[PDB]
Design a protein around this ligand. Structure first.
Ligand code: BCL
Ligand code: BCL
Ligand code: BCL
Ligand code: BCL
Ligand SMILES: CC[C@H]1c2cc3[nH]c4c(c3C)C(=O)[C@H](C(=O)OC)c4c3nc(cc4[nH]c(cc(n2)[C@@H]1C)c(C(C)=O)c4C)[C@@H](C)[C@@H]3CCC(=O)OC/C=C(\C)CCC[C@H](C)CCC[C@H](C)CCCC(C)C
Ligand SMILES: CC[C@H]1c2cc3[nH]c4c(c3C)C(=O)[C@H](C(=O)OC)c4c3nc(cc4[nH]c(cc(n2)[C@@H]1C)c(C(C)=O)c4C)[C@@H](C)[C@@H]3CCC(=O)OC/C=C(\C)CCC[C@H](C)CCC[C@H](C)CCCC(C)C
Ligand SMILES: COC1=C(OC)C(=O)C(C/C=C(\C)CC/C=C(\C)CC/C=C(\C)CC/C=C(\C)CC/C=C(\C)CC/C=C(\C)CC/C=C(\C)CC/C=C(\C)CC/C=C(\C)CCC=C(C)C)=C(C)C1=O
Ligand SMILES: COC1=C(OC)C(=O)C(C/C=C(\C)CC/C=C(\C)CC/C=C(\C)CC/C=C(\C)CC/C=C(\C)CC/C=C(\C)CC/C=C(\C)CC/C=C(\C)CC/C=C(\C)CCC=C(C)C)=C(C)C1=O
Ligand SMILES: CCCCCCCCO[C@H]1O[C@H](CO)[C@@H](O)[C@H](O)[C@H]1O
Ligand SMILES: [Fe+3]
Lengths: 296, 237, 266
């Protein structure tokens, strides 16, 4: 269930047929914390080529936003930390089009910041790329990612390039991107009538459930380390056999220590794949969803 | 247009589902299934694209869709008439390995690791392995359910990789030993229990081969017995 | 396989008259009840998308006894077929879960699947009973239409300003979200291992563990993730339950005013 006598020997590690140079971040066993629940270690790490930027970049983004973040506050703590949610960087909307050549305070920051985070994601993308390599895994997370990137790449890039208007991108602030949402509803014609959206919900629930199903299984399956999934997709003992019997019987029909994660990598990815489709339609190839709908 | 979108998307879907997806579920599970309903109770797929695996460091090879049955003594009888019908174990089930009990038969080769670290050793055998946070079952007199105790803790065989307190050795009063899986047992301050398994036996606990190493059939053979307790132990219920 | 697992007993109640497997299905005196409670449901029900005249899988619908009609009463046309039909889930479901124990108990396995969904059958009730029951009325319970529900949803929602403001709401999303990839990673991990590059030998348990400390520089091997996963999930649903139960009842105002509790004082 969740560790009741904790152990933790030395400090462990592995090849990478690759640039191990990286190693800073030192084995600092965590016990009460990330121990009781998960894993006691803490690092090592591997701050490769790419990983640098990810960070370099990943911050500016944070810095830039963080910056014009202050100005609204007027360089004031009590201020700054009040309207903190409330503060926000809104694009060159100043609605005036996929026409860069912007002012800092209108376009600017945003065109700057936003557009800079282009990079993190992008790179760090690579990251999951080779961290696989070294180890010579497959390349699934590279796969199980461009989802995360679709609805990204879209939501703030593709689309607004489609209406010839960043005027169309989502804005940076806590309580702002929330708001920039439904606003987004009202204009696409109450948008639940959106086919793709519902799937996207179709699924974003599909998980909740299933992580709540796969997870909760393996647990009734410790009794026999159902958890050891590889030294199982090679060799079946009760573990598998029965964590599938349950379902074979209950809902009649079952899966396979692999397929199940075959059920998994997907179950989730659609959850994003989907919405991305949803969203390059919902301002073009569909001015309204009621309508479109009512016309079906 | 988007009707061509959402209308063919409905291909990527039906597409995968009973395709890849459920296809893979099959890969190496009752690569088709008999005993009454012959060739099925409807219209699956005649077993997918058979594929082969790569057994880890040390080599081996497994081709997944395979018909490795079992004439490995199912003491499982008959209850009558139709299939779906239960099938009673021919006497004390816990042993013959059937019902809750039932084991399997993974290799007589324990799951190695990274290298040859046969992954699951005992605490002594170990390098620098002790108890960060916890009580220590060691010397912890293991109870039963009975309430007549059935042994004294002798180790916690450690999992190297996960660094997982995998099992806890327990020496009966035949100056003997046997290890009981961790996700059984309740380490309470002064006392212990793999309650599942009334003391008033315990013995059932199959032995391992060498007293340093739990091989697959070991772990697996071990692991059932214990549980069957759940199913098949009078007190409890 | 199975054949050995098809082994008398585990019966919560039924004793015997129930130890059997309609083929792939283990009957037992809950599937048997699961039944009696699904039939009688869609019967009374199906009786409704009639009475409605129209129907259309799509727009056959069921609403409860609309507000001030009361908590008490209602009649198999303004109330009832909803009423009753409801008492058919908060029971057909509960009934199955149990069918869930029964399979477990015998199946050898462990406790928790049946607990996890016990949350689901717990989200629901909230919305169609708790919420309702507290607002001394069953009107915040909801439709039963493949399509209204957005509506029933879409309004109450907006009943309280941009609902994406109710805090707890804030949250549950972010579990909802996280417990997502949270699968996007797990579902992708186990995989790459199990199914590697072109010729490389099947990977290692600590083959994985090794990736993550490299991407992320922590990493919660095998077990730790199936718990964690069943975590963010189970949670977030529930943190949903809070959202509401709380929304119609100690926040009468548009959500955006909450937020000031902060933006007050010094
Ligand atoms: C409070 C939130 C709302 C809600 C909001 C939504 C949203 C939002 C959408 C759906 C849609 C779905 N809803 Mg719902 N839905 C609610 C509660 C329910 C209940 C219930 C028994 O309590 C049921 C059976 C359903 C059932 C369904 C399906 C018919 C449809 C596919 C779901 C799915 O994949 O989920 C996951 C599980 C499986 C995949 C298995 N809803 C509550 C009342 N539902 C979609 C729909 O409206 O059609 C497009 C959709 O986009
Ligand atoms: C009230 C407002 C509108 C509405 C407006 C929208 C809008 C607008 C959009 C969605 C979309 C979604 N909505 Mg909707 N939605 C409403 C009603 C609902 C309800 C409900 C009624 O029950 C439900 C359940 C849903 C459910 C959903 C999800 C299925 C879906 C995306 C969520 C997700 O899982 O991926 C979320 C995935 C991501 C956010 C991936 C992001 C990846 C990036 C690259 C990672 C960035 C990391 C960064 C660099 C670091 C920052 C770290 C943080 C500080 C921690 N909506 C109402 C009708 N919804 C999306 C959609 O599918 O549109 C087609 C979307 O765009
Ligand atoms: C426009 C309206 C508002 C808003 C208004 C509301 C309202 C109003 C409510 C929510 C709730 C929800 N919203 Mg909100 N929401 C908005 C926008 C969002 C966005 C977004 C991206 O913008 C997101 C991601 C969300 C997220 C969500 C989820 C946290 C949550 C759903 C609860 C839940 O799933 O319980 C899931 C519960 C179940 C699935 C119930 C049990 C189902 C049954 C029992 C399962 C068995 C059924 C049957 C047997 C299956 C058999 C199948 C067949 C035999 C095959 N909302 C907009 C801005 N939201 C709901 C919530 O908090 O509920 C607690 C809610 O009431
Ligand atoms: C897809 C629909 C909308 C949208 C609708 C909403 C709604 C609806 C909710 C949030 C909330 C959140 N959103 Mg948002 N959000 C969108 C796009 C984004 C993007 C992006 C695409 O770059 C990012 C990084 C964020 C970031 C965030 C977080 C601050 C927060 C929950 C974190 C979370 O669980 O992440 C998971 C990953 C980690 C935890 C790591 N959103 C799109 C445009 N978002 C929630 C909030 O309360 O924030 C204050 C909330 O309820
Ligand atoms: C499959 C769909 C889901 C998905 C998938 C997905 N995400 C992924 C993967 C996949 C499959 C990874 O492999 C990749 C990964 O490497 O991280 C786990 C990742 C990831 N998903 C991320 C975020 C993310 N994904 C999201 C959504 C989704 N990702 C979907 C739910 C969300 C939302 C919107 O819920 C978020 C916030 C990152 C954790 C990671 C890749 C992020 C990346 O591009 O790198 C960003 C670089 C930086 C942030 C630079 C760092 C400095 C910054 C200023 C950050 C401040 C952090 C703060 C200081 C910490 C404070 C906490 C402390 C108190 C501890
Ligand atoms: C709460 C934690 C997450 C979760 C987990 C969960 N669900 C589970 C499990 C687990 C752990 C199961 O083991 C169990 C199952 O065996 O699933 C495969 C189940 C399950 N989760 C279900 C559904 C569902 N889960 C939901 C959510 C979640 N499930 C959570 C996110 C949702 C939503 C929308 O989030 C949906 C749609 C079922 C597939 C299944 C068990 C359902 C069951 O008991 O069905 C029996 C069928 C009948 C009795 C016929 C119905 C008779 C009714 C009287 C009439 C119908 C009225 C009802 C309102 C239908 C809906 C009306 C309108 C709203 C449409
Ligand atoms: C490693 O572990 C695991 C596995 O490994 C083997 C698994 O396979 C699974 C299973 C997971 C999958 C297969 C993934 C895909 C599945 C999901 C995404 C959910 C999809 C399925 C559903 C939505 C439900 C399917 C059917 C349901 C829920 C009900 C359908 C019921 C019938 C068709 C008939 C029901 C009959 C019953 C209830 C009783 C029969 C009649 C009687 C008892 C009365 C008669 C006498 C009187 C999981 C979860 C797992 O974790
Ligand atoms: C068997 O399967 C599996 C395992 O087992 C071997 C695993 O270990 C894991 C690993 C799973 C996790 C680590 C959980 C996934 C995410 C969560 C559990 C929440 C934790 C999220 C993070 C810690 C945030 C990510 C951290 C970032 C982006 C750091 C970026 C900034 C820096 C690194 C600063 C630079 C420091 C020097 C998974 C997924 C799995 O599926
Ligand atoms: C496509 C645009 C996606 C933006 C969605 C939210 C992106 C920013 O989200 C958050 O990150 C900032 C970091 O500077 C925080 O300071 C703010 O809370 C907010 O900007
Ligand atoms: Fe898993």
């Amino acid at each position: 269930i969740f560790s009741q006598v904790q152990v933790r020997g030395p400090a462990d590690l592995g090849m990478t047929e690759d640039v191990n140079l990286a190693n800073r971040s030192g084995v600092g066993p965590f016990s009460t914390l990330l121990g009781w629940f998960g894993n006691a270690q803490l690092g090592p790490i591997y701050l490769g080529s790419l990983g640098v930027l990810s960070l370099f970049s990943g911050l500016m983004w944070f810095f830039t936003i963080g910056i014009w973040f202050w100005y609204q506050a007027g360089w004031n703590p009590a201020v700054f930390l009040r309207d903190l949610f409330f503060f926000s960087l809104e694009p060159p909307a100043p609605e005036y089009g996929l026409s860069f050549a912007a002012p800092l305070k209108e376009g600017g920051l945003w065109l700057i910041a936003s557009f800079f985070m282009f990079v993190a994601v992008w790179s760090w993308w690579g990251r999951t790329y080779l961290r696989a390599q070294a180890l010579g895994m497959g390349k699934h997370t590279a796969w199980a990612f461009l989802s995360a990137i679709w609805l990204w790449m879209v939501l703030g890039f593709i689309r607004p390039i489609l209406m010839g208007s960043w005027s169309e991108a989502v804005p940076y602030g806590i309580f702002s991107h929330l708001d920039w949402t439904n606003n987004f509803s009202l204009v696409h014609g109450n948008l639940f009538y959106n086919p793709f959206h519902g799937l996207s919900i179709a699924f974003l629930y599909g998980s909740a459930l299933l992580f709540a199903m796969h997870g909760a299984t393996i647990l009734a399956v410790s009794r026999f380390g159902g958890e050891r999934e590889l030294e199982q997709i090679a060799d079946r003992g009760t573990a598998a056999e029965r964590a599938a019997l349950f379902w074979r019987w209950t809902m009649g029909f079952n899966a396979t220590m692999e397929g199940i994660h075959r059920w998994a990598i997907w179950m989730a990815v659609l959850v994003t794949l989907t919405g991305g489709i949803g969203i390059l339609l919902s301002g073009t190839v569909v001015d309204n969803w009621y309508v479109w709908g009512q016309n079906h | 247009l988007a009707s061509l979108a959402i209308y063919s998307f409905w291909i990527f879907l039906a597409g995968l589902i009973y395709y890849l997806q459920t296809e893979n579920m099959r890969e190496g599970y009752p690569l088709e299934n008999e005993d009454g309903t012959p060739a099925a109770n409807q219209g699956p797929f005649p077993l997918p694209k058979p594929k082969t695996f790569i057994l880890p460091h040390g080599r081996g090879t497994l081709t997944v869709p395979g018909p490795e049955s079992e004439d490995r003594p199912i003491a499982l009888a008959r209850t009558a008439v139709s299939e779906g019908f239960p099938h009673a174990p021919t006497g004390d089930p816990m042993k013959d390995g059937v019902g809750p009990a039932s084991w399997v038969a993974r290799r007589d080769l324990p799951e190695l690791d990274g290298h040859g670290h046969n992954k699951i050793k005992p605490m002594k055998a170990a390098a620098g392995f002790h108890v960060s946070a916890g009580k220590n079952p060691i010397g912890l007199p293991v109870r039963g359910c009975d309430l007549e105790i059935a042994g004294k803790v002798v180790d916690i065989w450690v999992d190297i990789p996960e660094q997982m307190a995998r099992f806890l050795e327990v020496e009966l009063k035949d100056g003997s030993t046997r290890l009981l899986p961790m996700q059984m047992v309740k380490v309470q301050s002064n006392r212990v229990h793999v309650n599942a398994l009334s003391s008033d036996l315990f013995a059932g606990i199959p032995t391992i081969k060498s007293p340093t190493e739990v091989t697959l059939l070991e772990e697996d053979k071990i692991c059932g017995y214990v549980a069957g307790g759940l199913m098949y132990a009078a007190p409890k219920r | 396989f199975e054949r050995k697992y098809r082994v008398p007993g585990g019966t919560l109640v039924g004793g015997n008259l129930f130890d059997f497997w309609v083929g792939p299905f283990y009957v037992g005196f809950f599937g048997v009840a699961t039944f009696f409670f699904a039939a009688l449901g869609i019967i009374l029900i199906a009786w409704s998308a009639v009475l409605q005249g129209t129907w259309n899988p799509q727009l056959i619908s069921v609403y409860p006894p609309a507000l001030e009609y009361g908590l008490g009463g209602a009649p198999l046309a303004k109330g009832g077929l909803w009423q009753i039909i409801t008492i058919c889930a908060t029971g057909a479901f509960v009934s199955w879960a149990l069918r869930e124990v029964e399979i477990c108990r015998k199946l050898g396995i462990g406790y928790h699947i049946p607990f996890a969904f016990a949350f689901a059958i717990l989200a629901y009730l909230t919305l169609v009973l708790f919420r309702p029951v507290m607002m001394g009325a069953w009107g915040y319970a909801f439709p039963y239409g493949i399509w209204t529900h957005l509506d029933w949803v879409s309004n109450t929602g907006y009943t309280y300003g941009n609902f994406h403001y109710n805090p707890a709401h804030m949250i549950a999303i972010s579990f909802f979200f996280t417990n997502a990839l949270a699968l996007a990673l797990h579902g992708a991990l186990v995989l790459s291992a199990a199914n590697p590059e072109k010729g490389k030998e099947m990977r290692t348990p600590d083959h994985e563990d090794t990736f993550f400390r490299d991407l992320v520089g922590y990493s919660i091997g095998t077990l730790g993730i199936h718990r964690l996963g069943l975590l963010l999930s189970l949670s977030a649903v529930f943190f949903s339950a809070l959202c509401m139960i709380i929304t119609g009842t100690i926040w009468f105002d548009q959500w955006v005013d909450w937020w000031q509790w902060w933006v007050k004082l010094p």
